[PDB]
């Protein structure tokens, strides 16, 4: 019966910096708000309850304030392990979660490590030919991959998958797969993936050539 | 140490029933209410209700009135969530807790066909020097439903692993995983990917071999 409007829905901030998240309740919730951290693959972690009280074991760089309908939550001295989605929770009248804030750490820009892989013998002899490029440990998240066969761009048959941001080094990784049939694969020689990213003024190019192996 | 341990992942068809367990330790089970929280794929947390662990009385949020049942086994310090007449839209990860929380139980509700994956090793082509590190991969293709677990050397390689989220490709899922090791250590120190697909009861190893 109480709505919770959480803002912003996502943000990026530098290491060592301080961010603030807000929640607005539809009615006075009498300081009965809590804040949670939630990482993929794990249960939520309670950080703050009754607006400003720290859970035992939670560092004081987490803080909260507010009253009435308006509440705020801050993380100071940001570190890579703060990558998570944060939620407010009113518990004055039943419970309601806010919509969440996905937090990204803005580390220094990092170029991808690009690796290309030809189709495996097992996949080929079963009639398929997937060519795979890993673009690993880069920042920021935006990246473009172009595939070329014998020098000509190919867009049909490409699937791209990004990881979430890693706490180990605040980077992303992405996998790009060009899937052809064996029949079409064995009629061409050169297969190339080209990565366009903020960190390079020209594309990062990895290729292999069927006729050379 | 406060710990909540939930039962393992579940695969069900629409119309069936599932019962998920949440076993507490490290605090007095009957002194704190147990809450249940749903996280649908790609969505935020949604509160389902709570159970009074001193009386057994459950309270449900409006969206979870009807097919959902909270219960207890006080003597085993265990809370249960039962979902009757399962729906596709019950597909989600469910968490129990209050201040501390269980690890989550992932529930998949589907009537579609279970299909095992094909598992392909990704080794560098014969004509390229990778530098001081070498990255190896495994392509996991054509399976249903989610999920799969991909490990490297039975989990002993993990610091440099990237697990790429699955994508739907012609009605079936495809995912990949990479690992990176120093070039001096491969092929001399073997690297193998293992792919478990519990829905199809399959486990497949593929040794990575140089081209």
């Amino acid at each position: 019966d109480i709505q919770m409007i959480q803002s912003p829905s996502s943000l990026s901030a530098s290491l060592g910096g301080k961010v603030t998240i807000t929640c607005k309740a539809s009615q006075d919730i009498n300081k009965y708000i809590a804040w949670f951290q939630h990482k993929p693959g794990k249960g939520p972690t309670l950080l703050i309850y009754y607006t400003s009280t720290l859970q035992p074991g939670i560092p004081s760089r987490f803080s909260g304030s507010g009253s009435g309908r308006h509440y705020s939550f801050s993380i100071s001295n940001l570190e890579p392990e703060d990558i998570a989605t944060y939620y407010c929770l009113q518990y004055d009248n039943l419970r309601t979660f806010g919509g969440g804030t996905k937090l990204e750490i803005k580390r220094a820009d990092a170029a991808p490590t690009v690796s290309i892989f030809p189709p495996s013998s097992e996949q080929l002899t079963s009639g398929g030919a997937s060519v795979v490029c890993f673009l690993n440990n880069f920042y920021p998240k935006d990246i473009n991959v172009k595939w070329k066969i014998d020098g000509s761009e190919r867009q049909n048959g490409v699937l791209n998958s990004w990881t979430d941001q890693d706490s180990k080094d605040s980077t992303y990784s992405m996998s790009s797969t060009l899937t052809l049939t064996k029949d079409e694969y064995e009629r061409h020689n050169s297969y190339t993936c080209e990565a366009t990213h903020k960190t390079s003024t020209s594309p990062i190019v990895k290729s292999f050539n069927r006729n050379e192996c | 140490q406060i710990q909540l341990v939930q039962s393992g992942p579940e695969l069900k068809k629409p119309g069936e029933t599932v019962k998920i367990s949440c076993k507490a330790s490290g605090y007095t089970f009957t002194d704190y209410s147990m809450h249940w929280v749903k996280q649908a794929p790609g969505k935020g947390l949604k509160w389902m209700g709570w159970i009074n662990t001193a009386t057994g009385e459950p309270t449900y949020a409006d969206d979870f009135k009807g097919r959902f049942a909270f219960s207890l086994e006080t003597s085993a310090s265990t809370a249960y969530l039962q979902i009757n007449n399962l729906k596709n839209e019950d597909t989600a990860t469910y968490f129990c807790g209050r201040d501390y929380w269980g690890q989550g139980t992932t529930l998949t509700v589907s009537s579609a066909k279970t299909t095992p994956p094909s598992v392909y090793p990704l080794a560098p082509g014969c004509g390229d020097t990778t530098g001081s590190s070498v990255t190896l991969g495994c392509l996991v293709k054509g399976y249903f439903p989610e999920s799969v677990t991909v490990t490297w050397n039975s989990g002993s390689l993990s610091s440099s692993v990237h697990t790429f989220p699955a994508l739907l490709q012609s009605g079936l899922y495809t995912m990949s995983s990479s690992v990176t090791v120093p070039s001096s250590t491969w092929p001399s120190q073997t690297v193998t990917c293992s792919v478990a697909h519990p829905a199809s009861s399959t486990t497949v190893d593929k040794k990575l071999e140089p081209s």
């Binding site: 009965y32 035992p56 | 209410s33 001193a54």
Partner: peptide
């Protein structure tokens, strides 16, 4: 067991 929040641990 209550409608409380926080303080466990």
């Amino acid at each position: 067991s209550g409608r409380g929040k926080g303080g466990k641990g």
